[PDB]
Amino acid sequence: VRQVSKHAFSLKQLDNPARIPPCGWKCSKCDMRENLWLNLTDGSILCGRRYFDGSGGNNHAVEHYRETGYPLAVKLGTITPDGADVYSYDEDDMVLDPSLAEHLSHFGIDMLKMQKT
Template sequence: MELLRSHLSRVRIPEPTNRIYKQECCISFDTPRSEGGLYVDMCSFLAFGRGYVQWNYEKSGNPVYLHIQQHRKPVPEDRPLKKPTLLAIGVDGGFDNQEPEYEETHSIIVLPDHVCLPFPSVELPEKVRLAADAILMTEGAERKEQIASWTSEKKRVSAYALDLQQINSGVVIPPSGWKCQKCDKTDNLWLNLTDGMILCGRKNWDGTGGNNHAIEHYNMTKYPLSVKLGTITVDLEGAAQMYSLIRRMTLLRIHY
């Protein structure tokens, strides 16, 4: 365990916006069902087969991996067919194509000596346990992309986005720690897509919400579109909340 503790700086606990690859090697076609299983880099969250994990270690310097292996179970001859609820194959709710079931096992691997530590284990450092649990509980990026291709919805395009003016003002939007640039509000914040101004939203009838600074900014500049901070994720999952200020902040959900 002391070896693992010396590498804790190279272990990250995934955040909701991180893309986690755990179904297929980024270089080969290896999966958790391959002979050597799959190794998830616990720093970059990229997955590698047995033949490429050493290459990734030498390239990135990341020594700690979550090893995922799936072993095939016998398929009962009398297994009932499941009624599909989703137009897809091989995913929960999709068509049952009588694929066999698999038992999944996990361990923590420390390179370069390929030291294998059992998981789950209370003896592992807490950071490693939390990181591994988060990786296993999060939907894999590969599966998200697969499901999205089957369940794509009709896109709604704002006319104001077609020729939206964007000013190169040198503004850098930080990943967190936002606040209105005209008051101290830190919630209900909107990023103007023309000049990068971060301003609070409209005031509600009961006095809650913002201070109308986003609308006031539009009245001065006529810059028409803003996006609510926190609704666009790195993996582009879900729908961003966009407002057309021309229509007095009428909600548009832009799927991407």
């Protein structure tokens, strides 16, 4: 029923188009769309820690850990086929997860299709 637009053939696109911002997510407790961490236990997506001087995120991911005890979280936008930034609230350090692929797959995430943001 739909017809080809009379503009399709000669549509004038801008010469210097600011490549649209890569896709993303949003903390489920605030408006942050950057510095987001997905907890590997429940798949919650929350923002990074707030630092003493006010920099950082809004502390939602760490508060989630305090409440649940779920230790691992991966930083969205850092996932590539070779790995990703994973933090352990438990061990207080960035760690490696040999089973990251399975862990991410658990929530319907193809660790191979993800692109570093």
